[PDB]
């Protein structure tokens with residue numbers, strides 16, 4: 001129960017970050033990939049990671065009523081099951097892009 | 105919250121801005137957990153500003169840069185590759201949230217209850233002092249990076265001239 | 269004072285320092301009057317930074333007056349003082365100059381949706397004029413401090 | 425404010441029609457006008473022999489400032505903004521004019537006496553100021569209008 | 579050299595102070 | 609309550625007799641009344657009135673306090689000790705160019721600078737540090753302001769971590785000792801600062817004949 | 820830290836570690852035992 | 854016994870005869886200071902004896 005809730009929350013969260021990475025990977029071609037993380041100074045990552053961590057833990061800029069409509073319970077679980085299926089679809093997709101950058 | 109840990113002789117209960125009068129319990133527990141971890145990190149930060157001036161690690165963080173080439177201070181941040189810094193954050197972040205390499209049964213001594221609260225106030229007092237120390241260390245180091253010898257104290261660890 | 273106008277979802281009852289804690293009802297009305305009046309000037313200050321560029325006014329030339337903090341030295345100090353006291357006529361005594369007497373509409377549910385909208389547009393303007401005053405003053409002492417024009421919007 | 429030389433001095437009908445609640449407002453208006461005027465009389469004669477050491481604005485020393493109304497335009501307006509607003513904090517809030525030591529513990533009988541020459545000393549000072557910035561303003565626009573060319577006639 | 583460290587001032591003041599305190603404390607209590 | 613009970617265990621026990629029994633405790637009651645002269649009141653100010661005598665106690669305390677600061681002020685300044693930088697950047701007044709002489713420092717320091725010193729004293733005297741009639745004479749620092757206080761039974765700490773409570777009558781550490789030492793150093797500096805003024809008036813040396 | 824200074828520090832540490840502390844511990848043990 | 858002006862002044866300084874701290878008192882702190890004093894005395898003896906040679910300390914007659 002208690003352990004399953006942590007696995008449940010991690011499954012959703014891992015599926016999310018994979019989704020924003022995919023859309024976040026096509027805007028740059030419209031400083032490319034893993035070559036970019038070394039190009040940006042680590043002081044830049046210190047500011048950005050902690051800003052994500054504020055949203056991740058406290059919900060500073062990521063917990064608002066505009067993102068949670070009332071809707072209805074019949075399609076809520078239908079959309080929430082859809083949240084995982086798209087999350088998994090982006091999850092298995094992601095590894096091929098990082099392995100493409102001169103890896104196995 | 106006057107009858108809590110952290111009340112010590114020279115000042116007593118120190119809260120001039122009233123940041124704890126109208127707060128609840130859970131924010132105070134978060135405040136003390138923040139104070140304890142801010143002090144613990146600042147205590148290790150003071151140690152981490154002096155030890156590399158004496159001894160360095162022999163290997164390499166990354167194949168490009170070795171430990172000895174890394175300049176001590178805030179100049180260290182840009183010298184080491186950014187991918188290495190991101191791995192350290194999540195490594196100590198795993199111990200921060202879960203405690204993968206912490207919460208061990210050894211290293212947590214059970215003592216007299218009055219002795220335990222005394223050592224806990226000592227832990228807070230050292231952390232509070234080192235938090236003040238980390239501000240002076242960072243202020244002297246960062247300003248000396250922008251303008252070399254801005255304040256005229258040149259050396260990184262000004263108060264310990266036997267290191268240089 | 270949580271049950272009062274100005275509470276809006278991102279901040280809620282924003283009071284970290286606790287300046288509204290343990291104060292009487294007269295001080296909060298005083299705080300509210302200072303909240304409103306500071307805001308109202310800041311909206312007009314934002315207007316008074318862009319509109320004196322396109323439109324001018326008819327012993328100092330009105331067009332030759334540089335917009336911003338350089339206007340203070342250009343206008344004579346005696347010429348500045350009767351403007352200061354003229355605003356005080358409408359401030360303390362309330363001898364309305366912008367209007368004749370003042371004809372405000374009162375709609376019950378819109379009153380909450382206007383008064384709250386009044387102070388927070390002023391709150392945003394108060395946050396905005398800090399940047400407007402910073403860019404003008406820092407560039408005046410050092411021409412091209414950040415290497416930018418006077419007004420970040422490009423329609424001038 | 426009734427003094428033995430004159431009586432209820434009101435030639436233009438400014439105290440009969442008007443009510444006594446707002447008549448107290450003219451009393452503060454009269455007292456504050458005299459208090460400004462009393463300080464302006466001494467404040468007009470002091471800069472002749474003594475001036476402040478440094479400068480008031482960058483490039484504007486205290487020494488090379490005309491004592492009369494030309495000092496208004498000599499000091500920059502932003503300097504005047506700071507001075508006027510600090511005065512108004514005392515004027516409205518009573519920031520630096522509310523200390524209890526300035527309210528002496530006086531018995532009744534000499535109190536309403538002392539308030540009587542307070543507005544009376546300010547009363548002549550209002551007219552004395554009205555001559556001070558008069559002769560200053562005439563001589564500032566055109567030099568030597570009156571027979572004398574001195575800001576202080578003594 | 580005779581005027582160094584105040585000259586004879588401190589020994590004169592010091593000796594006078596000791597003599598005055600002894601005379602002050604010389605009397606009986608009551 | 610929390611983190612305070614370690615003091616009671618670290619507190620050293622009460623002093624006893626060497627035999628084992630409890631120790632038997634077995635003129636100078638007012639601050640300023642001490643061994644050498646006792647109550648030295650040649651003008652009998654205490655006989656003038658209780659309100660008049662309380663005025664003179666606060667008056668001696670205040671006069672003595674500024675005299676100690678004034679004496680220490682001249683001694684460092686006449687030695688050549690200076691703050692770094694400019695006293696007046698507009699007037700091009702470095703600290704090094706301000707004379708160590710009392711009259712020299714009184715004249716060279718700008719009157720605008722002297723006003724700032726005076727207005728700080730006026731602000732302290734009129735609003736911030738007022739004498740409370742209920743409070744002790746000289747106790748003008750309000751609560752909340754960080755001040756070194758020595759109440760009866762305050763704690764001092766030894767090498768092993770043991771705690772000793774200091775009574776008011778303790779030598780060098782009690783409140784009455786520090787209260788008496790403030791009055792006396794104030795009295796000595798009151799004669800000192802006036803003597804340094806007149807010696808410098810006559811000779812130009814505040815510490816004449818030293819130097 | 821010269822070799823003579825290091826030798827002195829080692830001598831003090833050695834005296835405490837293998838003379839003072841073992842004799843004191845043995846004394847405490849035999850005093851509580853007997 | 855005779856009461857004098859100075860005797861009344863010095864009276865509280867001699868009024869605590871036989872007063873002790875119960876038990877061992879501060880003997881543990883005293884033993885630490887004695888042990889530190891013993892180590893300090895051995896240091897300055899061995900410096901004089903040249904059994905401890907410091908870095909910039911030369912035990913010989915100095916100039917100025």
Ligand code: CLA
Nearest residue numbers: 017020021022023024025027028031032033034036037040
């Ligand atoms: C975690 C998701 C993610 C990842 C891994 C990437 C990948 C990358 N992006 Mg990127 N991005 C994302 C999200 C992501 N993107 C999205 C959703 C968009 C569409 C708006 C973009 C548009 C974008 C821009 C405009 C740029 C990059 C750049 C980069 C590269 C530099 C490293 C970096 O992350 O800087 C991140 C730096 C940013 C400025 C990220 C922008 C994300 C914005 C602020 C939206 C996110 C906030 C929030 C979720 C929005 C909703 C709030 C509310 C309105 C509901 C790297 C290859 C930079 C690079 O130089 O190109 C190679 C660069 O200039 N991306």
Ligand code: CLA
Nearest residue numbers: 108109110111116117118123124135136138139142232235
């Ligand atoms: C992260 C820092 C941090 C936090 C969260 C706390 C939290 C706490 N402290 Mg505390 N402390 C700290 C650091 C901290 N401390 C430092 C550095 C000192 C030395 C000055 C102290 C000295 C101290 C004493 C002596 C006592 C406390 C006490 C407390 C408790 C109640 C007071 C309160 O409401 O705090 C709320 C804290 C915050 C809301 C965070 C501080 C935010 C302010 C605005 C920061 C101000 C700027 C700062 C000075 C940096 C300046 C940067 C410069 C460039 C300008 C609470 C558990 C009391 C106690 O422990 O419990 C009974 C108590 O007696 N503190």
Ligand code: CLA
Nearest residue numbers: 046047050053054057137138141142145193194197200201
């Ligand atoms: C992924 C890594 C990770 C994880 C999972 C955690 C886990 C946690 N931490 Mg750690 N932590 C990390 C990284 C991590 N930490 C690192 C690298 C350090 C330094 C060794 C710390 C030291 C630390 C402290 C001192 C505290 C925590 C707290 C927390 C908790 C609150 C969540 C949070 O971080 O707030 C998100 C962060 C914020 C809301 C503040 C971010 C802004 C600050 C000022 C940092 C930014 C500094 C900036 C980059 C430097 C430039 C400054 C300027 C020029 C821009 C959470 C349990 C807090 C706690 O336990 O209770 C409150 C707490 O006080 N952690």
Ligand code: CLA
Nearest residue numbers: 272273274279280281282287288299300302303306391394
């Ligand atoms: C003149 C400015 C001013 C004044 C008088 C007030 C007063 C008030 N505000 Mg409000 N506010 C302001 C500015 C102000 N605010 C700004 C700029 C914002 C946008 C961030 C807000 C957003 C806001 C929210 C979201 C809420 C309030 C609320 C309130 C009320 C209760 C809180 C309080 O006691 O504040 C007292 C404040 C003061 C006495 C002024 C403090 C000024 C500090 C010391 C300045 C600190 C420095 C500042 C950041 C500028 C730095 C510049 C730098 C270059 C030095 C009260 C009527 C609450 C409400 O509306 O009513 C229930 C509430 O929920 N305010």
Ligand SMILES: CC(=O)O[C@H]1CC(C)(C)C(=C=C/C(C)=C/C=C/C(C)=C/C=C/C=C(C)/C=C/C=C(\C)C(=O)C[C@@]23O[C@]2(C)C[C@@H](O)CC3(C)C)[C@](C)(O)C1
Nearest residue numbers: 311314318367370371372389392393396399400419420421
């Ligand atoms: C006769 C009579 O009684 O009728 C009256 C009664 C009645 C009803 C009361 C009336 C009223 C009241 C009125 C007129 C109210 C008006 C409301 C008003 C005027 C509200 C503006 C918003 C300002 C903001 C928030 C500015 C933000 C600006 C922002 C976001 C900035 O960043 C500033 C900026 O500079 C930067 C930093 C960079 C630049 O690149 C861009 C700009 C310049 C934008 C009327 C209509 O008069 C009629």
Ligand code: KC1
Nearest residue numbers: 356360449452453454456457460508509511512513515516
């Ligand atoms: C921005 C700063 C500021 C504010 C906020 C302010 C406020 C008020 N002033 Mg003050 N005032 C100045 C500045 C400010 N005044 C300055 C620099 C001077 C010296 C030149 C000055 C002198 C007088 C005189 C002679 C009188 C006077 C009064 C009032 C009163 C009525 C409002 C009004 O009439 O404008 C309100 C509280 C009169 C009074 O109380 O009558 C009922 C009155 O007779 N003032």
Ligand code: KC1
Nearest residue numbers: 038164165166167168184185186187188189190191192195
């Ligand atoms: C087991 C899986 C694993 C792989 C496959 C892997 C690989 C690389 N790591 Mg290593 N790593 C760990 C595990 C793994 N690492 C662990 C458990 C820790 C915590 C002790 C850790 C810490 C650091 C730090 C501090 C740095 C670091 C680096 C590299 C880099 C070196 C070649 C390169 O330069 O690309 C290659 C990719 C450096 C870096 O990223 O520099 C850009 C760097 O500074 N790592």
